[PDB]
Amino acid sequence: VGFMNKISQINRDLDKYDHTINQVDSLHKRLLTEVNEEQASHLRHSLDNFVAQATDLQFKLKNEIKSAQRDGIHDTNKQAQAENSRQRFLKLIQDYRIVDSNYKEENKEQAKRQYMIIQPEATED
Amino acid sequence: FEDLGVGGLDKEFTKIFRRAFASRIFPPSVIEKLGISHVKGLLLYGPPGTGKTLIARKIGTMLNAKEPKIVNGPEILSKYVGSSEENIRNLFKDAEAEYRAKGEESSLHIIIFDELDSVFKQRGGVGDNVVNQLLAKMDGVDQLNNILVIGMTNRKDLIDSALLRPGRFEVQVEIHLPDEKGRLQIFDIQTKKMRENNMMSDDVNLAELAALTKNFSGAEIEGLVKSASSFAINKTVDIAKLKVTREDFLNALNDVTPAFGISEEDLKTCVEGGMMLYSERVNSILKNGARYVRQVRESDKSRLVSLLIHGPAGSGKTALAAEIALKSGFPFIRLISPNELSGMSESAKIAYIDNTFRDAYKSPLNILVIDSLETLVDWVPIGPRFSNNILQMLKVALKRKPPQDRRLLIMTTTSAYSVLQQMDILSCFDNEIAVPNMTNLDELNNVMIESNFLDDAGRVKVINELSRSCPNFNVGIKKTLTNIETARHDEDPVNELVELMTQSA
Amino acid sequence: GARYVRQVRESDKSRLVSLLIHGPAGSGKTALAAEIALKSGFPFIRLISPNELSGMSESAKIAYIDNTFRDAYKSPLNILVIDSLETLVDWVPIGPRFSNNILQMLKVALKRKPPQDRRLLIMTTTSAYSVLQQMDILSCFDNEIAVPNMTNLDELNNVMIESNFLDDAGRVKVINELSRSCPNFNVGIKKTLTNIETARHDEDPVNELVELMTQSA
Numbered sequence: 001v002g003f004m005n006k007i008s009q010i011n012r013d014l015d016k017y018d019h020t021i022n023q024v025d026s027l028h029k030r031l032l033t034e035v036n037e038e039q040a041s042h043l044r045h046s047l048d049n050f051v052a053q054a055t056d057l058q059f060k061l062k063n064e065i066k067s068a069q070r071d072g073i074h075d076t077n078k079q080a081q082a083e084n085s086r087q088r089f090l091k092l093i094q095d096y097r098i099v100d101s102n103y104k105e106e107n108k109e110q111a112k113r114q115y116m117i118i119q120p121e122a123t124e125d
Numbered sequence: 126f127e128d129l130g131v132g133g134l135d136k137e138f139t140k141i142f143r144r145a146f147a148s149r150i151f152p153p154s155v156i157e158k159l160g161i162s163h164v165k166g167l168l169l170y171g172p173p174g175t176g177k178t179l180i181a182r183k184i185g186t187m188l189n190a191k192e193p194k195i196v197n198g199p200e201i202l203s204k205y206v207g208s209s210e211e212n213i214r215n216l217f218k219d220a221e222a223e224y225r226a227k228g229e230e231s232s233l234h235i236i237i238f239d240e241l242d243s244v245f246k247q248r249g250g251v252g253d254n255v256v257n258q259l260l261a262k263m264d265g266v267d268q269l270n271n272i273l274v275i276g277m278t279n280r281k282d283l284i285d286s287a288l289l290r291p292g293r294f295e296v297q298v299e300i301h302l303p304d305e306k307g308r309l310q311i312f313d314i315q316t317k318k319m320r321e322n323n324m325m326s327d328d329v330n331l332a333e334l335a336a337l338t339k340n341f342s343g344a345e346i347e348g349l350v351k352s353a354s355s356f357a358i359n360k361t362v363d364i365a366k367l368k369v370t371r372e373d374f375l376n377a378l379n380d381v382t383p384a385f386g387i388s389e390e391d392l393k394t395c396v397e398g399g400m401m402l403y404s405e406r407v408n409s410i411l412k413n414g415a416r417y418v419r420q421v422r423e424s425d426k427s428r429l430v431s432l433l434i435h436g437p438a439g440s441g442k443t444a445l446a447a448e449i450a451l452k453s454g455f456p457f458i459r460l461i462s463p464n465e466l467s468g469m470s471e472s473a474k475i476a477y478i479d480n481t482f483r484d485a486y487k488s489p490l491n492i493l494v495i496d497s498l499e500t501l502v503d504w505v506p507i508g509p510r511f512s513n514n515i516l517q518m519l520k521v522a523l524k525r526k527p528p529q530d531r532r533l534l535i536m537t538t539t540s541a542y543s544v545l546q547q548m549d550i551l552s553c554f555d556n557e558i559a560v561p562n563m564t565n566l567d568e569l570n571n572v573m574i575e576s577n578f579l580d581d582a583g584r585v586k587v588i589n590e591l592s593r594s595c596p597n598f599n600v601g602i603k604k605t606l607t608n609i610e611t612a613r614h615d616e617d618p619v620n621e622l623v624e625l626m627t628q629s630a
Numbered sequence: 631g632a633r634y635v636r637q638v639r640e641s642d643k644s645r646l647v648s649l650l651i652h653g654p655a656g657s658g659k660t661a662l663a664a665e666i667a668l669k670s671g672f673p674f675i676r677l678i679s680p681n682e683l684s685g686m687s688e689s690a691k692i693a694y695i696d697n698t699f700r701d702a703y704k705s706p707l708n709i710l711v712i713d714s715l716e717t718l719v720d721w722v723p724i725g726p727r728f729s730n731n732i733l734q735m736l737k738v739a740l741k742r743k744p745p746q747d748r749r750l751l752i753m754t755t756t757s758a759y760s761v762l763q764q765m766d767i768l769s770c771f772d773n774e775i776a777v778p779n780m781t782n783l784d785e786l787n788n789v790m791i792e793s794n795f796l797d798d799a800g801r802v803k804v805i806n807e808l809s810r811s812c813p814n815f816n817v818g819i820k821k822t823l824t825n826i827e828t829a830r831h832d833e834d835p836v837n838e839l840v841e842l843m844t845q846s847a
């Protein structure tokens with residue numbers, strides 16, 4: 001009965017971790033949109049306080065999934081539960097990677113956009 | 126070799142003796158029959174305060190040379206035209222005179238330059254004239270083979286290319302820090318007046334003392350011993366038996382601060398507020414740090430690791446770095462923060478940083494921490510503006526593997542993740558730790574019991590009020606601690622603490 | 631590379647040749663460049679890298695570079711290697727800012743014929759091909775090698791066996807697991823080596839490495 005409680009804990013945490021990835025995705029897209037207005041431009045940098053928790057949940061799921069798979073060595077059902085958690089966590093990792101890559105590819109294009117043109121009049125010295 | 130007062134330097138004397146004196150010891154009949162000239166220059170290099178002056182001095186006495194003539198680098202310069210170099214010329218006069226007069230039976234002369242790179246940079250101003258003057262004379266049209274010149278420096282990679290040719294500065298030698306055997310021998314040599322004259326107790330075991338002192342430079346051991354003896358005698362004032370016991374040694378050892386050792390004081394200051402585990406994360410973070418420390422110490426191929434910790438502002442990030450450092454026991458520890466660098470000029474900052482990098486490569490084992498990045502880089506978002514050069518210094522630094530088997534761990538912290546990716550610097554770092562701030566009420570409970578804010582009634586009521594009021598509590602620890610103190614030293618905890626705490630989240 | 635070496639050693643007219651090795655970061659360009667250089671026997675070989683150009687001032691940068699070219703003319707056969715052009719010059723994207731004079735110096739230098747029929751070869755490396763196109767410097771070079779990443783599991787197994795990290799069941803387990811865990815696979819060798827070594831110490835079995843290999847891609 002302890003083990004099933006642990007697996008429920010894993011399930012609930014994986015659900016939040018998915019949620020945070022999706023929130024982060026939105027934070028990306030609106031940071032791409034709005035380049036102009038000063039203070040709100042700074043405001044989307046709260047994405048930091050979305051990234052930190054993603055890392056922490058990653059480290060947690062790391063440790064508890066390792067403990068669970070160790071615990072399930074002698075029971076096939078426990079092992080099945082552990083493997084399901086592994087599969088789902090791997091999928092999450094894949095989602096995170098995809099989001100990161102897409103955002104990197106998009107940040108390059110905006111960078112190319114801005115300076116591939118004649119520029120504001122020359123600096124001071 | 127070791128009959129004379131120099132401990133730990135063994136290979137160096139075999140090499141130097143073999144190359145330098147093996148052609149001045151035999152009768153001139155033989156070596157003349159051999160037809161070989163004499164080495165006429167020497168460059169030994171190393172960190173300061175390692176005993177270079179001493180070795181240079183003792184060499185002359187071994188050969189029964191004339192008394193050494195001494196000069197130091199920057200003093201050569203004068204501010205009139207061509208006298209800055211006249212001084213360089215003056216030094217060889219007596220050797221010339223005695224050579225012309227006597228001939229081949231003259232007695233050897235010795236000259237010592239100090240801080241050679243201070244003037245003699247690569248050529249191509251006064252500087253070219255100085256370098257020229259030394260070249261034309263060190264080996265000129267007229268033969269002069271009864272002289273020897275010794276060179277002392279810290280940076281070999283800046284001297285002009287021509288002085289290092291076979292004929293001017295033949296033998297290049299390196300002086301490194303003493304090993305354990307070096308420290309033991311150093312103690313043995315230094316404590317000779319005490320030993321024979323019988324004013325050291327029999328309880329002190331200098332081998333233990335040697336083991337206890339790591340990265341001590343070899344000069345400061347003298348400081349230790351003289352301080353300990355002075356301590357003992359001052360404690361006495363009786364002439365029964367003036368004995369120096371281990372307590373003096375322990376006291377003096379505790380007092381002194383080596384140059385290449387732990388800088389404890391600033392780290393203790395960094396963590397002045399204490400480390401209380403108000404939640405579960407703290408344990409995990411510290412475990413991570415310990416893990417990485419082990420990985421550095423035990424491996425062979427991973428001679429360097431870069432580790433980043435980041436999180437929201439005020440999350441208390443730097444303290445964790447200091448804590449991880451202090452619970453490790455490595456010999457070399459230093460801290461770079463904006464605090465030191467404030468007020469300096471740009472060139473000064475780059476110099477400071479780069480010095481602070483190079484020193485570490487010497488020691489076997491090192492950890493090095495950086496306090497904040499956007500601050501050092503001079504970021505300000507409107508425009509934006511920042512200094513490119515310092516950025517490049519750091520960028521280059523964070524890839525340099527230690528030149529030899531020495532080992533290094535680099536720790537750094539920031540709050541502006543987003544900027545760093547937009548900078549395209551993020552590739553420096555292998556692994557990351559995150560530090561989010563508190564979003565719970567029980568955590569408030571843990572901290573306030575640890576701070577002992579008030580009696581249980583106030584505590585319970587405030588947690589109840591914030592439970593019923595603030596549902597999505599979210600702030601860092603800084604404001605929590607300062608707000609708690611403000612409420613304590615103010616009146617009526619509900620009147621402020623609750624209100625402030627809502628106003629802050 | 632060997633062909634180019636032979637070509638430069640024996641040809642009356644071809645006194646000067648310039649190559650470009652480019653590829654994604656971590657694909658491991660410098661290693662190849664050094665390997666080409668070593669197996670030629672050319673008597674004068676010397677290297678420029680940001681490693682040496684650390685913490686001096688700009689005038690010093692130019693002076694040092696100039697000297698390093700000048701001395702090369704004074705020998706019959708020579709090879710020079712240049713590391714991370716786009717980094718000697720101080721490229722940083724926002725603005726974008728970078729130093730001009732060094733770029734110009736290199737632009738001029740890479741075209742100069744050595745005097746009296748002496749022989750020179752130049753290799754240079756970069757990881758930012760696009761910006762090189764943008765700055766309009768790409769004219770100077772006669773040819774271009776390309777280095778891609780590793781992209782198949784069998785290659786990874788080759789790497790494991792060269793490291794002698796694998797066991798016999800271990801390779802099967804890891805290879806199959808990653809075969810179904812990752813459809814597309816592309817990473818730099820540098821990271822691969824780092825990963826294998828960090829995996830060799832703690833939790834040697836397949837798991838740590840598997841999720842780490844994912845954690846690379």
Ligand SMILES: Nc1ncnc2c1ncn2[C@@H]1O[C@H](COP(=O)(O)OP(=O)(O)OP(=O)(O)O)[C@@H](O)[C@H]1O
Pocket residue numbers: 395396397398399400401402407437438439440441442443444540602603
């Ligand atoms: N576990 C802890 N959580 C939070 N603060 C702590 C903790 N332990 C100690 N502190 C306190 O945090 C302070 C040191 O952290 P520090 O001032 O570097 O925070 P920071 O967020 O890095 O600062 P800044 O907001 O300027 O970036 C000290 O008052 C220290 O006692």
Ligand SMILES: Nc1ncnc2c1ncn2[C@@H]1O[C@H](COP(=O)(O)OP(=O)(O)O)[C@@H](O)[C@H]1O
Pocket residue numbers: 130131132133172173174175176177178179180311342343344347
């Ligand atoms: N290896 C050593 N053995 C004995 N004494 C040393 C050694 N190194 C330094 N010292 C002591 O330090 C002083 C010599 O200074 P030194 O270290 O030669 O100056 P620097 O290294 O700054 O040129 C002397 O008192 C000398 O006895």
